[PDB]
Enzyme design. Structure first.
Site, mmCIF file in Angstrom:
data_model
loop_
_atom_site.group_PDB
_atom_site.id
_atom_site.type_symbol
_atom_site.label_atom_id
_atom_site.label_comp_id
_atom_site.label_asym_id
_atom_site.label_seq_id
_atom_site.Cartn_x
_atom_site.Cartn_y
_atom_site.Cartn_z
ATOM 1 N N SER A 150 0.849 -1.204 0.000
ATOM 2 C CA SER A 150 0.000 0.000 0.000
ATOM 3 C C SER A 150 0.880 1.248 0.000
ATOM 4 O O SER A 150 1.707 1.374 -0.917
ATOM 5 C CB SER A 150 -1.116 -0.098 1.043
ATOM 6 O OG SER A 150 -2.120 0.882 0.809
ATOM 7 N N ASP A 173 -8.178 -2.787 -7.520
ATOM 8 C CA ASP A 173 -7.721 -2.539 -6.161
ATOM 9 C C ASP A 173 -8.757 -1.727 -5.377
ATOM 10 O O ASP A 173 -9.308 -0.748 -5.882
ATOM 11 C CB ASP A 173 -6.392 -1.784 -6.224
ATOM 12 C CG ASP A 173 -5.834 -1.483 -4.872
ATOM 13 O OD1 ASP A 173 -5.074 -2.323 -4.332
ATOM 14 O OD2 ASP A 173 -6.145 -0.392 -4.358
ATOM 15 N N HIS A 205 -7.080 -5.765 -1.671
ATOM 16 C CA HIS A 205 -6.053 -4.765 -1.398
ATOM 17 C C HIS A 205 -5.012 -5.406 -0.490
ATOM 18 O O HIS A 205 -5.374 -5.984 0.537
ATOM 19 C CB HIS A 205 -6.658 -3.501 -0.734
ATOM 20 C CG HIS A 205 -5.680 -2.373 -0.567
ATOM 21 N ND1 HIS A 205 -5.026 -1.795 -1.635
ATOM 22 C CD2 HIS A 205 -5.229 -1.732 0.538
ATOM 23 C CE1 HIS A 205 -4.214 -0.847 -1.199
ATOM 24 N NE2 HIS A 205 -4.327 -0.780 0.116
#
Ligand SMILES: *[C@@H]1O[C@H](CO)[C@@H](O)[C@H](O)[C@H]1NC(C)=O
Ligand SMILES: COc1ccc(-c2cc[nH]n2)c(O)c1
Length: 341
Positions: free
Chosen positions: A145, A243, A287
């Site tokens: 991330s 995503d 994610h």
């Protein structure tokens, strides 16, 4: 378990001035080192950083960090959980700078918070050289991330650091998970938060990319498809085609308009990866992946992520039956049967 060490240079700090640090588990029979950058959004002015300090304080301070952390996924030492690098030296670097790992600014009488992510990475590397990193053959800088974007921003600076310190034998590589975003049109009505953040943090981007976009336009280098072509270190890119963080920013929470929007997003992401030779991009709504315990389960074209990373290692010594570029072609989330439920 990985054990906490606070930085010996106490001038390299989290947002609130407390020392930054790292969690370490050594493997003395291995010359492989994995340094993982945690994610967790960011903050970009005094008022929203104050809110983050109230309810996300572990992402801004080390005062409450625990003595140990369990290594999971690619950070696990168990072959069954981590077929790729189970015997490596393991490092987890907590994200306490709120700056997508880009900052180089200290607290002062004019700065309520310190944004030091880029300096934290370099100080962790320095202090690890005394704990065995001096003998390494490969340093893999990984992240998820905001940490995945952090890999793209920092991998070449780590390579330069080690060269300048006199360690040209250590091969520096990057693994960017869930940090490859598109500056696209939203589904309902952005980049101005990144532009404001960079100024607030004194954020730094890689040299070659900064020279391309020039003053005032460094925000461009936070977008994978624009910064990746400028990088010299080998970088493997992991990105779900749909995503969840990308769709959140795009204001997507199914009629024809939304169907076409979602299909176009997957097509555009697939296009940005066509010339990325080491990549893994499944057609799933999710994610992050690399530190999840079940990261071994997903496959693209019959090949798992741990296998693709192993094939990448072999390529850095095409390989029959051991591919490294794996991007789904089917156009809707979970058209791949192995997607996470
Ligand atoms: C500690 O870190 C700061 C910021 O990177 C640097 O200016 C200083 O020289 C460092 N101290 C030592 C002893 O390396
Ligand atoms: C999840 O991270 C993201 C995703 C999308 C954007 C963006 C920018 C302009 N349009 N969309 C972003 O700035 C960050």
């Amino acid at each position: 378990d990985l054990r906490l060490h606070l930085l010996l240079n106490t001038s390299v700090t989290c947002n609130d001035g407390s020392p930054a640090g790292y969690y370490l588990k050594e493997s003395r029979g291995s010359r492989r080192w994995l340094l993982f950058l945690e994610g967790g959004w960011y903050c970009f002015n005094r008022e929203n950083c104050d809110s983050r300090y109230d309810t996300m304080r572990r992402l801004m301070s080390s005062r409450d960090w625990p003595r140990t952390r369990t290594g999971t996924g690619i950070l696990s030492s168990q072959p069954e959980e981590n077929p790729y690098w189970w015997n490596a030296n393991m490092v987890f670097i907590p994200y306490c700078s709120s700056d997508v790992w880009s900052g180089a600014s200290s607290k002062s009488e004019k700065n309520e918070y310190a944004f030091m992510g880029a300096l934290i990475i370099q100080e962790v590397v320095r202090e690890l050289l005394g704990r065995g990193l001096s003998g390494a053959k490969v340093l893999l800088l990984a992240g998820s991330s905001a940490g995945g974007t952090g890999v793209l921003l920092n991998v070449d600076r780590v390579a330069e650091q080690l060269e300048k310190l006199g360690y040209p034998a250590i091969q520096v590589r990057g693994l960017a998970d869930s940090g490859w975003f598109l500056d696209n049109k939203q589904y309902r009505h952005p980049t101005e938060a990144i532009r404001r953040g960079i100024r607030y943090w004194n954020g730094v981007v890689p040299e070659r990319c900064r020279r391309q976009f020039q003053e005032g336009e460094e925000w461009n280098c936070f977008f994978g498809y624009k910064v990746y072509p400028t990088l010299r270190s080998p970088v493997f890119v992991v990105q779900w085609l749909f995503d969840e963080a990308q769709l959140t920013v795009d204001n997507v929470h199914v009629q024809e308009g939304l169907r076409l929007y979602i299909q176009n997003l997957g097509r555009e992401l697939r296009h940005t990866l066509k010339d990325v030779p080491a990549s893994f991009a499944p057609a799933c709504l999710s994610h992050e992946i690399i530190i999840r315990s079940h990261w071994t389960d997903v496959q693209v074209k019959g090949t798992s992520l741990p296998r693709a990373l192993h094939c990448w290692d072999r390529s850095l010594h095409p390989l029959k039956g051991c591919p490294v570029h794996l991007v789904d072609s089917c156009p809707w989330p979970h058209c791949n049967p192995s997607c996470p439920t």
